């Protein structure tokens, strides 16, 4: 159950890392694709597809970073330290009603 809440805390932070990874993996999808374009295009079509790559760059990834990742944006339970208290005392049973 301690790993149950630890999974609640870390899988949210790891989903943040998964979507930050998703946006920067898909800028690699742009570049590794266009590297194959350079080796497959006659020079007339390369000037056209350089304009299309520039336009797709400025339209998709043109502005700022839309994901904010900030403690304010996080839920309210990304703030506390998982306080533990109690005991497991093993004693006998009373011999009288």
């Amino acid at each position: 159950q301690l790993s149950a809440m630890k999974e609640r805390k870390t899988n949210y932070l790891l989903a943040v890392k998964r979507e930050l990874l998703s946006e920067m993996l898909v800028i690699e999808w742009m570049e590794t694709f266009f590297a194959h374009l350079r080796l497959s295009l006659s020079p007339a079509e390369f000037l056209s597809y350089k304009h299309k790559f520039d336009l797709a760059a400025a339209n998709i990834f043109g502005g700022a970073v839309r994901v904010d990742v900030d403690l304010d944006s996080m839920p309210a339970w990304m703030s506390e330290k998982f306080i533990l208290q109690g005991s497991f005392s093993v004693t006998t049973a009373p011999y009288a009603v």
Binding site: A76, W77, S79, E80, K81, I83
Partner: peptide, 12 residues
């Protein structure tokens, strides 16, 4: 800690 907040609301 906010769970401890809710426990004290029920209790004293």
């Amino acid at each position: 800690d906010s769970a401890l907040r809710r426990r004290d609301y029920v209790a004293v």
